[PDB]
Design a protein around this ligand. Structure first.
Ligand SMILES: *CCC(=O)Nc1cc(Cl)cc(Cl)c1Nc1ncc(OCc2c(Cl)c(OC)cc(OC)c2Cl)cn1
Length: 272
């Protein structure tokens, strides 16, 4: 019983559903071919991802998917987020259609590009910093549209055929959480900044697991006592320094997403 949004409705007969990408409890995501997602060249095919409900699903589940769709509409478009492309709402099940990033999530993209042993891999320093910069730009955008992510991590960043970073799942993990989130259930833009520092560490370990070894119970005590992760091998001091600023206990002493963009920009500018 959903209204027809002229800005977003896409013809159900021009979406060819394909292979499942993932299945939750009461919903799923499938790869699809869409024809005419570019209104200009309307016969062109493109590959998209489609979120939908499973048959085993309640009115609540439907309310949640509608909420995610509407929130994505309101936030609007950016190069560094997974964008809404279209919806199918009429005469059949709810489909929410989004960009499909060819190279999967950033953790897997990094781990698969780990070079053997001590050897050089295809990911240069400037490419790594560029990954971080792009994430920061996406987060600065979401922040300007009043979106707090709450689960920023390399697994929730996707990578396109052209190696563009796109933040996923912004319109719906203790090692990624700020203290105030851990202990006080408080999530702000500044708690997302803490997570971004953890993400930075992931990037510069080529997809390593945070607080390596350290059992998930010693973490809170480590943090309370002023401990943080050590500088990863080959990570320059400047980038470690940024990680450490994001992990200040006091939210107000962490950098803003605007300052992280500017810092990472200075680094990329200095690299010839
Ligand atoms: C694009 C081709 C493809 O198969 N890509 C692929 C393959 C694997 Cl094995 C893993 C991944 Cl992560 C991908 N890429 C991919 N891109 C986009 C996806 O969209 C899911 C999705 C997101 Cl991220 C979203 O965040 C804003 C919202 C919605 O719906 C509202 C969805 Cl469906 C999934 N996988």
């Amino acid at each position: 019983d959903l209204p027809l949004d002229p800005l977003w409705e896409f013809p159900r007969d021009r979406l060819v559903l394909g292979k499942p990408l993932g299945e939750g409890c009461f919903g799923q995501v499938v790869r699809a071919e869409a024809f005419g997602m570019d209104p200009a060249r309307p016969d062109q095919a493109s590959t998209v991802a489609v979120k939908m409900l499973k048959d085993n699903a309640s009115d609540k589940d439907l309310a949640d998917l509608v909420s995610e769709m509407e929130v994505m509409k309101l936030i609007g478009r950016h190069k560094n987020i997974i964008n809404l492309l279209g919806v199918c709402t009429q005469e059949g099940p709810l489909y929410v259609i989004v960009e499909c990033a060819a190279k999967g999530n950033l953790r897997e993209f990094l781990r698969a590009r780990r070079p053997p042993g001590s050897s050089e891999g295809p990911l240069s320093f400037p490419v790594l910093v560029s990954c971080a910069y792009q994430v920061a730009r996406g987060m600065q955008y979401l922040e300007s549209r009043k979106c707090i992510h709450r689960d920023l991590a390399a697994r929730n960043v996707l990578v396109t055929e052209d190696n563009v970073m796109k933040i996923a799942d912004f319109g719906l993990p203790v090692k990624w959480m700020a203290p105030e989130a851990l202990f006080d259930r408080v999530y702000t833009h500044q708690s997302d900044v803490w997570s971004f520092g953890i993400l930075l560490w992931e990037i510069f370990t080529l997809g390593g697991s945070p607080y390596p070894g350290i059992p998930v119970e010693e973490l809170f005590s480590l943090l309370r006592e002023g401990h943080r992760m050590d500088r990863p091998p080959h990570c320059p001091p400047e980038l470690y320094g940024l990680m450490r600023e994001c992990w200040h206990a006091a939210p107000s002493q962490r950098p803003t997403f605007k300052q992280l963009v500017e810092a990472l920009d200075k680094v990329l500018l200095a690299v010839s």
